[PDB]
RNA sequence: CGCCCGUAACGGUC
């Protein structure tokens, strides 16, 4: 929920925040909606997404400052744009997929609409990046068990795995719906829509074999790394970062990043439940 | 690191990426 | 007879 998390962030007068992920603004909107005396700088990694960004800063002058970067090269351009480390006083990270790439099938994350295996959330910024289609289209059996089965959770693992190897030297595999049906057809037709989600709805069984090559391409997982160390030493003492994660992996990743390991800088001081966990970088 | 290499992936893909075009 | 989810005790490699 929206109105929870600037709960954490406190937002008052004059203070500067980092929205790392804007998506559709609705954090960062939410943020103004409580006090407008603040200034928001706007991360995004999608073109699209960094696009409301700074349709914002023109419409919010004195307060949006728009960015477009991953949370790798957050760093150059934070500091790039005259930021000194140590000056914000709470760093906002919403992980996972905006709407506008999973509803748009022109962007291929949905098997619900038909679109390319594209999966990209740089889009069109980095043309020479894998797709998804790329990646079911090159490594081995062994390689994509592994990212299916780690990046996944997907139990069956290596049944998939044969079943794209097979498709794949028959004809490449390039669009959404057509990897679906390819996975889906290692299994009988009876388990296409057999997985129940979380609130006992009916999803098709491709939907974890979409979500390991989602983070996979987009290396959702180092990239988050680098990211929290980035919010950590542009985080002033006593500020805070709130972190939504969304799967086992985010959420451990975190969680390991806050306590600090790998394998006492942050007072921990909210952990909601789709898990929120915030601290208070000292 | 999360068991699975990008690095050692990633020509691994850039290999038939350009065997392509 | 096959699959899925959950659980449980099994064996040689990192
Ligand atoms: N590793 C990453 N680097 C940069 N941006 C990312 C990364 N992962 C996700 N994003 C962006 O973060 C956004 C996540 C979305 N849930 C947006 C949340 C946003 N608060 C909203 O109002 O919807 C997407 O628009 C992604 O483009």
Known sequence: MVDEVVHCLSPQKGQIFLDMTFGSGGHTKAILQKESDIVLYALDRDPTAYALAEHLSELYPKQIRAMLGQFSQAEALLMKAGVQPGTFDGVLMDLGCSSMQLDTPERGFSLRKDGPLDMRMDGGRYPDMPTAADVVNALDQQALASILRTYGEEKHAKKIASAIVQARSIYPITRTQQLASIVAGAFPPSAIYTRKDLLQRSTHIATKTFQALRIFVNNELNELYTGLKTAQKFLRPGGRLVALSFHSLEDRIVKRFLLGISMLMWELIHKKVAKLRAAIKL | ?21
């Open chain 2, 1 to 21: 690191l999360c068991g699975i290499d990008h690095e050692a992936l990633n020509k691994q893909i850039m290999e038939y990426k350009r065997r392509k075009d």
